[PDB]
């Protein structure tokens, strides 16, 4: 009863037999399973259309592209570089991250500082 499910042509991500809120990777990439009444009267935990924009959720930062899926990896958005961790889609933020053996600094807002830190 756990995991990604499609019910009545709506997508949900279940834990404890209940739809969870968050950004989770179903069979169709990372989707935003949102609280009820976030967009177009979605119900609790339904995956919503959420496109070409950032999402701040519980002090983490995601970016959704043009298909309502959270991006991963290096991304250049509004003049800045971000790196969205492949296994969570959360932006690297708050200090030093080692990515493919190189160390970079990312601000609290997820923006990569110029240059290499180690």
């Amino acid at each position: 009863a756990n995991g990604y499910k499609t019910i009545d042509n709506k997508n949900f991500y279940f834990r404890n037999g209940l739809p969870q809120i968050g950004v989770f990777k179903g069979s169709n990439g990372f989707e935003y399973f949102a609280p009820a009444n976030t967009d177009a009267n979605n119900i609790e935990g339904q995956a919503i259309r959420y496109q070409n924009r950032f999402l701040h959720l519980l002090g983490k930062i995601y970016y959704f592209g043009n298909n309502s899926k959270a991006v991963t990896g290096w991304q250049t958005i509004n003049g800045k570089v971000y790196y969205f961790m492949p296994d969570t889609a959360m932006a690297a933020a708050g200090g030093l991250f080692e990515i493919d053996g190189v160390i970079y600094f990312f601000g609290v807002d997820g923006v990569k500082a110029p240059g290499i830190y180690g």
Partner: nanobody
Amino acid sequence: HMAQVTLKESGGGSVQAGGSLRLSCAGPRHIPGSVCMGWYRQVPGKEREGVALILIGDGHTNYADSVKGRFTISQDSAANTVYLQMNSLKPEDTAVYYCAAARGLSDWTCSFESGVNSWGQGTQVTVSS
């Protein structure tokens, strides 16, 4: 893979030798991966040459030797948009300047060589004696 992007250009113009002009080039707000943006120039009848590139969100610059110390490339601090400040213009700078976007190299540098992914439609700059 780097999808093609639209590059919208503005600026240019016509000046006497010694003048200054600015170009601007805007890309889409979101480009996956790393991106070098800037300009090449081509006089009708001649070959295209690199002018200046910058790696957006990091800042490596690459300039043609013929424009170093006269043209400066910068990025907008809130957009996937670059500017070329063309100071100390010479008649030999007269050309069509084309905005370009290309993937950043793995060491966070931009090269004029090995391919451009997307081009702007071009801006004429004319400098008279």
